[PDB]
Amino acid sequence: GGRIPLWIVATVAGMGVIVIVGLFFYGAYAGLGSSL
Amino acid sequence: GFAWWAGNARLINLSGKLLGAHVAHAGLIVFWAGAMTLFELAHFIPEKPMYEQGLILIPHIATLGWGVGPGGEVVDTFPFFVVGVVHLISSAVLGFGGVYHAIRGPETLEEYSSFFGYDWKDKNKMTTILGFHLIVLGIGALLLVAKAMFFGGLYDTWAPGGGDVRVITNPTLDPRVIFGYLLKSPFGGEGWIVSVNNLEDVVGGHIWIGLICIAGGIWHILTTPFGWARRAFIWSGEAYLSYSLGALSMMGFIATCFVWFNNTVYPSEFYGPTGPEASQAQAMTFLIRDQKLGANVGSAQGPTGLGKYLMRSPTGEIIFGGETMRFWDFRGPWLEPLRGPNGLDLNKIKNDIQPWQERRAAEYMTHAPLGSLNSVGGVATEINSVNFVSPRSWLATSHFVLAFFFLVGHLWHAGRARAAAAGFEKGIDRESEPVLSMPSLD
Amino acid sequence: ANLWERFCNWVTSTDNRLYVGWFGVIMIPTLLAATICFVIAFIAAPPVDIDGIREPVSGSLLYGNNIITGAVVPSSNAIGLHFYPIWEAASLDEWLYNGGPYQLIIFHFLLGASCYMGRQWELSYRLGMRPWICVAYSAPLASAFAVFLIYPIGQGSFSDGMPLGISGTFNFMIVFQAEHNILMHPFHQLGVAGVFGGALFCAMHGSLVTSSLIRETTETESANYGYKFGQEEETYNIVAAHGYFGRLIFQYASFNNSRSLHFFLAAWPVVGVWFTALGISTMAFNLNGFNFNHSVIDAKGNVINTWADIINRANLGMEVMHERNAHNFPLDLA
Amino acid sequence: RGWFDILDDWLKRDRFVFVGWSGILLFPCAYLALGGWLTGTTFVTSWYTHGLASSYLEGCNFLTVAVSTPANSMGHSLLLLWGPEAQGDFTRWCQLGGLWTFIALHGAFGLIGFMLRQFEIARLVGVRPYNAIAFSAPIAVFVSVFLIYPLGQSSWFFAPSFGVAAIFRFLLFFQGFHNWTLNPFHMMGVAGVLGGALLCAIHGATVENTLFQDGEGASTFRAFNPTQAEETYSMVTANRFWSQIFGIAFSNKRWLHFFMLFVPVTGLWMSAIGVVGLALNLRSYDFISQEIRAAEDPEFETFYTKNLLLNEGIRAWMAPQDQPHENFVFPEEVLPRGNAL
Amino acid sequence: SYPIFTVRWVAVHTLAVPTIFFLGAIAAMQFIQR
Amino acid sequence: AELTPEVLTVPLNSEGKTITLTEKQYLEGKRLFQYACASCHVGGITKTNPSLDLRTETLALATPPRDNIEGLVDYMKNPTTYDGEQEIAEVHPSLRSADIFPKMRNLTEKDLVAIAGHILVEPKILGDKWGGGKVYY
Amino acid sequence: GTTGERPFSDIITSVRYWVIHSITIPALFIAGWLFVSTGLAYDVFGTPRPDSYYAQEQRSIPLVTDRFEAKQQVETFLEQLK
Ligand code: CLA
Ligand code: CLA
Ligand code: CLA
Ligand code: CLA
Ligand code: HEC
Ligand SMILES: CC1=C(/C=C/C(C)=C/C=C/C(C)=C/C=C/C=C(C)/C=C/C=C(C)/C=C/C2=C(C)CCCC2(C)C)C(C)(C)CCC1
Ligand SMILES: CC1=C(/C=C/C(C)=C/C=C/C(C)=C/C=C/C=C(C)/C=C/C=C(C)/C=C/C2=C(C)CCCC2(C)C)C(C)(C)CCC1
Ligand SMILES: CC1=C(/C=C/C(C)=C/C=C/C(C)=C/C=C/C=C(C)/C=C/C=C(C)/C=C/C2=C(C)CCCC2(C)C)C(C)(C)CCC1
Ligand code: OEY
Ligand SMILES: [Cl-]
Ligand SMILES: [Cl-]
Ligand SMILES: [Fe+2]
């Protein structure tokens, strides 16, 4: 019902967004589309 | 009264918690200076110009005379390491006091001690705090004078021989020179205080500023605001914040122009060439190349009828031609040897250009401060290859943005401080709407 | 009843049909000077050598322009950022040839517009209002500073400021894109979103309030007569509007607090236009839009073009043609 | 009360996402237009239609990905999956540009579905249908730009491709080829879009700075109640302020909100008319009087002639790569260029 | 008493399910080399 | 298409001997060219003197021919004008002048080979783009 | 002001929800990854791999130039790679 506290769900979800987006920006400098 | 998104406004009348917020925030500032310097140093390569490496703090230290020798060559990186470690260490002490005063310390100070406690409306106390900080600032400016005169000097891009560290023995004290700057026009060829082009004036200005600040600090510790000042201002914490926001705004705009135009306290050796500098260097480069091929650059008429390489400014000075005609107010150490009383001297141009001047112009022309947000260097149509954005573009743009927002911050808090002081910041009283007791306009 | 106090009472009087105020004391002369010079120049000024190459550009109606092509032309590149008032010229003829009127107009206007913003604060204070309408206006004002002052400062010349004319504006735009790739700059992208979104929400709010007007008139009269100026009761049913819009999307995507809604209406285009003003203001220092030219190459190293490379082709065309006689050297560094 | 009424009942149940009869058209078509765009920008090339990479799979980023228009050789083919060009081969269909028609056609029917939804919900709730009427403006823009415009030209190829930078290319194409900034129908659109954004900001700010004090908190949001009868801000003070600041002010709350509907909707409708003209190359490209004088008098120069030189650079420099099916070979010596550059 | 499967449930997963699949595919793409 | 040994095969000297680079050497030479040369020679042009480019046909007609590894390695040690008549070490980066061009200090002999190999391979991939300038962007 | 569905905040803070979705989410992420790492995405969509935009000595785009032979034209371009 209200087990996992909401503020913990938001933190983990938010850091998951940061990870995925960060990996896309790393990819702008490596491999395809990096100009190298 | 305030929602969570305005939560720091709950600190307005909690002097002990507000002290913790300020001191913790100071630790953040000193932390960034410490960590950024180490990051820059960890990434530093001495064989590359600083401005090819995205450095903004190391160039500030080098300008003070630490770590560099003739020509701006980095000779010793240890002063960079020390400046960064000492800042980094000090942020722990400020963080420690900050969080203590914000969480555990007394919530308000005025019960604990009449010295440290304050009421925003106490004009005597407020000007006393101001005076203390004025003295600190005045000491701060004298530290730069101390470094320049007694502890090794400052880096001087104008020094004969390519630039070098130089002790300043004759700072300018003549107030006609020092205050003459404050009264120069900000327009082209004049440049207000941004035109300061020698270290003697820089050091002399800081002697003056230190004395004025210390004098003003003692003045404000000893006095209370006069009645004309009392009737002209709003006396509240938010009003004081709004005044400082306006001041920071003005200073950010000035700093923007300082880093964009000035190559004295922002040496091009470290920060790269200025916009005007790089544009002048391109004309120089092709003057040199064409003249070596046999071109008589003095007599060469360009497509418009103006000289292809050399023309006159609107007041007659011989200057570089092309679109760089706009940049003829540029002055720099690699170019001044070619200047006579009427501008660029054609005899010196024919006979006295040195290889070091050819190299420098080629270098500056190919490091003009143009680049993309993803750090592709050059004009916007250039292909990928060169990873470069000038430190001057980074420092100018960042501080223009900050200066703009702080001007908006000033408007926001100035208007609110006025409304709060008069009692209508929360909206219009339905039972006493001023317009309803006014006559109509028609 | 002192003479200075009587003047002071008139300047700040809330009974003047148009509020004057202390900001108005500066605003009224500077705006009149700028307006009068602009009208006269637009109609009659002779051609101006904007680029300093002795190639004058005709901007005024009497010299063969219409409303769309006419302009007050920016001042000569030979002047750069030098201050050029009338009394620095040997003659008005000189001052006109070199584009002196543009400087007089933009300086008087930026001063008068800045005081216009202050005047908005000032009257709000005399009427007992909240103070932040002037903060909304700082977004268009900052945009005017960017194209009239900031961009010339960073580029070194008022000759690269935006002309006071319709076709001159488009000229400024095209050249800006060739040299800064503004379309690929995120602050301009945010400006488009502030301007597109502002138009969207204007139409949304207008249609939702109009949709939920309470029946107060007959079919033979304008519904507008169902509202009387200064009536105490609201004129539409916000719960009905909320009930419609919440079902059009989903419930929690619709406002039912009018204060929150109108604050949102204020903030979206204001912040978007702040960013686009900041975009011009930072491209003034040549921090340009994203460059993905030749960012995709294949296993051998062949360039694989993207739409960014097509943009570059168009930008190259604008680059090579603009100011076709003003460049003697290969790089257009300013 | 037969099967039709029973279905009516279920479609109009009050639920988290209202469905309605309009939902039968809207939800499939909206989902497919959107899913088609995300699929194409993640996975699908434009190599065979444009000579362009255009997907994340190929190395593109969010700004450069696109679902690109079909090759010029397809004309205005519907490019049905089962049609004569792809012949039911899903892979060939992607490579020939079929996702573009898929998205444009499903998007069009989704827009219809959305406007019917606005009608349907308004009828059930009991409000006037002005939100639907305002939405006519985005519809006119979409159909004029994505359908009418390429239908007047040689092929779909010249419609906008669905991507950030592809649309940027569309803007610049229209400058250099149509001189679209010079077109009074676009200028009226500009005034409607910027006038709408102005009205949005100025109205929001005015309400927020003429509020009545209806609570004691410093956050003034809490002092509003959706069922209160009373106006939450002072129209009388707002009118006085603007009358003294600007000379004139609104006095009628109904006119004001109608005008906010009117200004951006009308602006968009005007621009759509101008694009319909450009479908036929019916441009406002030139002023004949300027051209006659400038041809005869080489000292006559305006911002108008300056811009046409820019347009000529754009055309000659982007056309070979932008219209690859035409096999334009422009030797270096024919390219228009000013001095040095 | 709350149902588990609703029209809402369908709409949510209609969007959420291919979204995570797509994020997985785009993540893998960051490691492709030419 | 791919980086095959045939494209990675470039002349070693004027005599006609050839050398076949590795992919690694090509990528190394591209990185080093960007580090030490691209600020003036991006895309095979010369920003400060556009009359002279890095196209193979241009290098072939220089005196000392420079369309081979040896000629290019020698140029990076002791650059001359295009006719061979004067040494230009004091205005052009080289090992002979690494005191005034500090980026040349830490280039080893194999770095020079990779840089030279990059310059010779790249026109084989890019064609007219290499040294063609903005017309071919 | 509710339509009878279970509130979202109740679902995502519930244990059972996380029991199911700590499996379903990584599985979907892994499936999408494999769609690319196995190369299936190239084949399904016909997207060139980095080695198959051009033939070895080829600098011409394989542009479709016929409406009704288009499918065959692509197929001939592909053969000329292998
Ligand atoms: C520089 C940023 C900054 C600083 C210094 C402060 C400081 C403060 N805020 Mg503000 N605040 C900020 C940003 C900041 N805020 C932002 C961005 C928001 C928007 C979300 C808010 C919203 C906000 C609200 C809504 C409120 C405050 C309040 C407060 C005060 C009490 C907070 C408290 O007791 O928390 C207690 C919190 C904890 C005990 C959790 C642990 C926090 C610790 C300090 C983390 C520090 C970790 C650090 C690594 C320690 C290093 C130790 C080492 C040096 C030895 C305090 C002075 C409150 C106030 O005014 O009270 C009257 C209040 O109500 N703030
Ligand atoms: C401007 C910042 C500032 C201000 C106004 C205050 C003010 C106060 N603090 Mg706080 N504090 C600060 C920073 C600050 N502190 C920092 C940085 C720390 C961490 C070290 C602390 C840690 C701290 C603790 C742990 C306690 C206080 C207490 C107090 C109160 C009594 C202090 C007293 O009588 O000392 C008398 C004055 C001195 C002993 C001064 C000695 C000489 C000093 C250190 C020289 C200063 C160095 C120089 C000027 C600048 C720094 C050098 C640097 C730039 C390299 C007073 C309200 C006490 C309190 O509230 O009691 C409940 C208490 O227990 N403070
Ligand atoms: C952080 C710095 C600071 C701050 C915030 C204050 C704040 C204050 N001071 Mg103090 N003051 C300071 C530093 C400071 N002072 C220093 C260093 C000195 C020594 C020189 C003095 C000397 C001083 C005196 C002698 C007096 C004050 C007074 C006052 C009060 C009224 C100020 C006023 O009306 O300004 C508004 C400014 C004016 C009315 C005139 C402005 C004229 C300037 C030069 C215009 C130029 C602005 C221009 C647009 C920007 C370009 C700069 C230009 C110079 C080129 C106020 C509490 C007054 C008071 O009540 O003291 C008890 C007073 O009589 N101050
Ligand atoms: C020294 C500077 C300074 C100081 C001390 C204050 C202090 C204050 N301000 Mg002011 N403010 C400032 C500058 C400053 N402001 C500037 C420059 C502006 C213009 C933008 C404003 C605009 C402003 C408004 C509009 C309001 C205040 C308010 C307030 C009060 C509440 C602040 C709060 O709780 O925020 C809490 C903090 C947050 C909610 C978070 C802010 C998050 C920012 C916007 C995001 C920045 C991200 C950054 C770009 C980096 C992105 C990277 C990514 C990883 C995030 C407090 C008295 C409020 C007030 O009037 O109270 C009396 C109020 O409503 N301020
Ligand atoms: C600007 C500061 C340059 C840098 C950095 C590099 N080069 Fe250069 N290069 C430059 C000029 C002005 C010239 C012409 C010199 C002359 O007057 O003859 C050159 C020439 C070359 C050549 C010869 C080209 C030819 O014969 O066609 C080569 C092979 C060359 N440069 C190579 C080169 C390398 C390998 C660099 C990085 C180590 C490099 N240059 C940097 C200007 C500049
Ligand atoms: C109040 C509050 C807040 C804030 C806070 C703050 C802001 C704080 C600060 C803090 C700080 C500011 C901290 C600091 C820290 C620091 C430290 C802890 C340091 C340490 C260091 C070290 C340990 C080092 C080491 C080294 C050396 C020595 C050498 C080199 C290397 C190295 C680096 C390793 C918040 C918002 C959260 C919330 C609310 C409340
Ligand atoms: C260091 C240096 C130097 C020097 C400097 C100086 C010496 C400075 C000074 C400065 C100054 C000396 C400043 C001043 C300032 C001022 C101001 C800034 C003012 C302000 C004002 C105001 C703001 C006001 C307002 C008002 C009014 C008007 C009305 C009434 C009300 C009020 C009050 C609000 C030099 C350059 C040489 C060189 C380099 C270094
Ligand atoms: C076409 C087609 C089809 C369909 C398909 C579909 C339907 C699809 C879908 C699809 C989908 C449905 C997809 C999705 C995807 C998504 C994504 C990929 C997303 C992403 C996102 C992101 C990246 C975000 C993030 C962020 C940021 C960045 C910032 C802020 C925060 C956030 C978190 C928001 C079919 C079968 C019929 C067949 C035919 C063809
Ligand atoms: O863009 Mn191109 O860059 Ca800024 O200057 Mn050099 O040319 Mn000219 O003055 Mn108007 O314009
Ligand atoms: Cl032009
Ligand atoms: Cl030039
Ligand atoms: Fe409203």
Numbering used by the authors:
A (entry chain J): 5 to 40
B (entry chain C): 32 to 473
C (entry chain A): 11 to 344
D (entry chain D): 12 to 352
E (entry chain F): 12 to 45
F (entry chain V): 1 to 137
G (entry chain E): 3 to 84
Task: Quote what the paper states about this structure.
The S3 state was populated by illumination of dark-adapted PS II microcrystals with two in situ visible nanosecond laser flashes, in which the interval between flashes was 200 ms to account for acceptor quinone QA and QB kinetics and efficiently drive S-state transitions. In the S3 state, all four Mn are formally in the (+IV) oxidation state. The OEC is oxidized in this step from the all-Mn(IV) S3 state to the proposed highly reactive S4 state with formal oxidation states of Mn(IV)4O⦁ or Mn(IV)3(V). The extra oxygen Ox, present in the S3 state, is lost upon S0 formation, indicating that Ox may participate in the O–O bond formation, and changes in its density probably inform on the onset of this process.
Here, we report room temperature snapshots by serial femtosecond X-ray crystallography to provide structural insights into the final reaction step of Kok’s photosynthetic water oxidation cycle, the S3→[S4]→S0 transition where O2 is formed and Kok’s water oxidation clock is reset. Our data reveal a complex sequence of events, which occur over micro- to milliseconds, comprising changes at the Mn4CaO5 cluster, its ligands and water pathways as well as controlled proton release through the hydrogen-bonding network of the Cl1 channel.
